[PDB]
Amino acid sequence: TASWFTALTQHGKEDLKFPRGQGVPINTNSSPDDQIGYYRRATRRIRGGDGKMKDLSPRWYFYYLGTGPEAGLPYGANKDGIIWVATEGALNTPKDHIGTRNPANNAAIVLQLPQGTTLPKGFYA
Ligand SMILES: O=c1ccn([C@@H]2O[C@H](COP(=O)(O)O)[C@@H](O)[C@H]2O)c(=O)[nH]1
Numbered sequence: 001t002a003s004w005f006t007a008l009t010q011h012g013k014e015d016l017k018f019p020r021g022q023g024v025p026i027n028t029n030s031s032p033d034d035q036i037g038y039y040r041r042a043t044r045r046i047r048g049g050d051g052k053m054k055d056l057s058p059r060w061y062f063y064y065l066g067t068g069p070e071a072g073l074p075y076g077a078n079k080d081g082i083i084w085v086a087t088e089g090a091l092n093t094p095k096d097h098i099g100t101r102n103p104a105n106n107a108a109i110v111l112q113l114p115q116g117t118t119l120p121k122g123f124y125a
Pocket of ligand 1: 103
């Protein structure tokens with residue numbers, strides 16, 4: 001199981017965060033009640049060439065509230081690597097009817113944000 005969407009990549013040194021009311025990827029199969037979730041940070045490192053580990057740019061993946069690797073965390077719960085996003089008017093209920101993605105059945109939806117959304121500096125898709 002995986003995120004329904006492709007990642008955001010962090011080039012700066014701050015964690016992801018969105019203005020209140022923006023941040024949820026567009027998904028034409030979801031309703032206005034579903035527009036709420038969290039982004040989870042994913043780290044990666046490689047043997048850097050000098051024999052030492054090299055940290056790569058963190059990526060951040062979105063999961064609907066109540067799904068994914070932190071399916072049990074309630075909205076706004078404070079956990080390192082977890083940041084919360086919601087469209088105004090989204091219901092605060094688990095989205096188990098959307099679930100997570102099986103890569104052996106569906107590729108990721110290309111991540112895109114609703115118009116007028118400001119990504120923090122150093123974050124790109
Ligand atoms: O936190 C993560 C890491 C990978 N993925 C995606 O899951 C898929 C499989 O990743 P994996 O081979 O590293 O398990 C691939 O499409 C990744 O981009 C997530 O959805 N969330």
